[PDB]
Paper text:
To obtain crystals of the (Pl)EctC enzyme with its substrate N-γ-ADABA or its reaction product ectoine, we added these compounds to a final concentration of 40 mM and of 20 mM, respectively, to (Pl)EctC preparations pre-incubated with iron. However, crystallization with this substrate was carried out at pH 4.2, conditions under which the (Pl)EctC protein is practically enzymatically inactive. The substrate N-γ-ADABA was added in large excess (40 mM) to the crystallization solution; however, the obtained crystal structure displayed only a partially bound molecule, which resulted in an occupancy of 68% after refinement. The N-γ-ADABA molecule is coordinated within the active site of the (Pl)EctC enzyme through six direct interactions with residues Trp-21, Arg-25, Asn-38, Thr-40, Tyr-52, and Glu-57. First, a direct interaction occurs between the O atom of the acetyl group of N-γ-ADABA (acetamide oxygen) and the iron co-factor with a distance of 2.6 Å. Notably, Trp-21 adopts a dual conformation in the crystal structure of the (Pl)EctC::Fe/N-γ-ADABA complex, in line with the observed partial occupancy of the crystals with the bound substrate. The comparison of the (Pl)EctC::Fe and the (Pl)EctC::Fe/N-γ-ADABA structures therefore suggests that the presence of the N-γ-ADABA molecule within the substrate-binding site of the ectoine synthase induces the reorientation of the side-chain of Trp-21 to provide additional stabilizing contacts to the N-γ-ADABA molecule. As can be observed in the (Pl)EctC::Fe/N-γ-ADABA structure, the water is replaced by the amide carbonyl group of N-γ-ADABA upon substrate binding. The (Pl)EctC::Fe/N-γ-ADABA structure reveals an extended conformation of the substrate within the catalytic core. The distance between the carbonyl C-atom and the α-amino group of the bound N-γ-ADABA molecule (4.1 Å) is far too large to allow a direct enzymatic attack to initiate ring closure.
Author numbering: 1 to 138
The structure:
Amino acid sequence: MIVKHLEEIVDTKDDIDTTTWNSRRLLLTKDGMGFSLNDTLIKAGTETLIWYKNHVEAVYCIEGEGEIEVVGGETYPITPGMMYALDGHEKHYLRARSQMRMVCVFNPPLTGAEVHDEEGTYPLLAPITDGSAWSHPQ
Ligand SMILES: CC(=O)NCC[C@H](N)C(=O)O
Ligand SMILES: [Fe+3]
């Protein structure tokens, strides 16, 4: 038996924050289920190029709006209830108009190394600046 809660995972080592996405990992390779499972926020205004050569991924949008553009294929708007699955290891752009909340399943599971390494993802456009600078401790 495994029991977890998103509200425990947030702001913890299983919450991986990147320039375009915050992935809250629910089932890890360690959990032995044969897949990994996460709840990922795709930040508003962002664009990320994605290509998982070594995994298939299912993505189910439960909040927000954006689009996925398949390189050499079509562009599919993303809204709550939209599901896509990359059974052909498709290279794709993932764009968020508003913040998107995505339940994601990977077939072999992703490892912690792969998530930290951002393997298979290339962030291209980050959220608009909030006015902060690294050199402003205030
Ligand atoms: C929604 C999406 O595709 N996020 C990509 C990150 C992925 N969930 C991962 O953990 O590598
Ligand atoms: Fe994806």
